[PDB]
Structure 1
Amino acid sequence: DIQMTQTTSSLSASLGDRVTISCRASQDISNYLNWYQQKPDGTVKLLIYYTSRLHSGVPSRFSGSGSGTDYSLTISNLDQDDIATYFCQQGTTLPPTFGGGTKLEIKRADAAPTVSIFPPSSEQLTSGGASVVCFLNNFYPKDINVKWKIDGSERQNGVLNSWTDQDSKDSTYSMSSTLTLTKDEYERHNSYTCEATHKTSTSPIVKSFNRNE
């Protein structure tokens, strides 16, 4: 097998910018190198074949170069639609082999998260479960921390976090945090807090409810 390596897996750039993504092969592949775009929904599109030739339909701001073992994809005048993962592939021998891909994030103005907390539902409690939930919606940059406090005491165990993909239109991220305990644990304590710590603010954003209300 020819091993294909993309040394950079993550890339963050601004609209209009020019980005270069590099690909390296374990042996000489004589320019039989192709480039593909995988959108977050999994759809895959051919961009460039044989190092530098454009596949039909592809905008001219995509271009490629290289020889021997080293190859590069260049995307200039970077577009909001280009949020994707970009894969290379050697076309010289079987099995056809692919690079690990480079993910591309489009930069955006910093935005603080709109935070919301919800108590366990009527129905869930009857089932004997109790999930407290927190949405931290429409923020940038992605990096963010959530802290749960039950009656003021921090809770690390039994918490599930889930980030969305970068929003394809506005470039924001959203995240849900979910604390799951038993009904009896839940009913032993009064206050439940959700604390968001993000670059946009020096002090955390705090939302909570009290059961005695």
Structure 2
Amino acid sequence: DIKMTQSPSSMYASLGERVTITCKASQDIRKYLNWYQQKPWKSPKTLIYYATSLADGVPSRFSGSGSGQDYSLTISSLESDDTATYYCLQHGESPYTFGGGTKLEINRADAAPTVSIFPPSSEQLTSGGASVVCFLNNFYPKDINVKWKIDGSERQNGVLNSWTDQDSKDSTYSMSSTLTLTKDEYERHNSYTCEATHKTSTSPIVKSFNRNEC
């Protein structure tokens, strides 16, 4: 019945920067608007209630204002752990309505990933499978590309790539790359390399190992 519009959808800002998120309703909601913060895979936390009041244990760098149909939340000086998704919620009319949310990412200085590569573990080889894992940790920006090469520029398919969310402490990202194979096919090849290209260097990071497992 009452439509909430949140803006922007996603934003990037640097530490010590002042941020402002907006929420507008389709009709005057009489100041019955709240703000929630959601950290990845944790239930939401209330920041502000009744447009301007600060909820339980929220820092003073958070504030809110607005009246009628226009509302805004403002974070005065960005701290690394303000990475989260923020939502506004109107409760002036039933049914209560959430805005679409805005994702905030901390802009930070580029960082190069530390790469690690693990061959198939014994436990797994014992069951007929061979998974090769490659970890790329604490890099920035998120933009990165990994390729797997089996015995040369002979690269492959059957890989699973996953990125964490942004770190609350140091504002970096991390990625896992898993090449999954059968014990059978693994034992027919010699070298396994995962290359990553990241703007922090014109050269690719070629991390390798030779099966030569005896």
- Please give the TM-score of this superposition, normalised by the length of structure 1: 0.91
2:132–2:180 contact (8 Å) kept in structure 1: yes
What is the Cα-based RMSD across aligned positions, in Å? Answer: 1.8
1:13 is aligned to: 13
Shift of 1:66: 2.8
2:173 is aligned to: 173
Other structure's SS at 2:167 match: coil
Map Cα deviations across residues 84-135 of structure 1 (whole Å, 9 max, x no partner). Answer: 2211000111221112211212222211000111111122112111101100
For residues 1-213 of structure 1, the aligned pairs below 5 Å read 1-152=1-152, 153-155=154-156, 157-212=157-212
* Unpaired segments ≥5 residues, structure 1: none
Map Cα deviations across residues 8-63 of structure 1 (whole Å, 9 max, x no partner). Answer: 23222111100111223233323221111122351432222222232353323212
2:7–2:21 contact (8 Å) kept in structure 1: no
Other structure's SS at 2:123 match: helix
Other structure's SS at 2:155 match: strand
What is the alpha-carbon distance in structure 1 between the residues aligned to residue 53 and residue 136 of structure 2?
43
2:101 partner amino acid: G
* Unpaired segments ≥5 residues, structure 2: none
1:49 partner amino acid: Y
- Please give the TM-score of this superposition, normalised by the length of structure 2: 0.90
Task: Work out the number of aligned pairs and report it.
Answer: 212
Map Cα deviations across residues 177-198 of structure 1 (whole Å, 9 max, x no partner). Answer: 0011112221222211101111
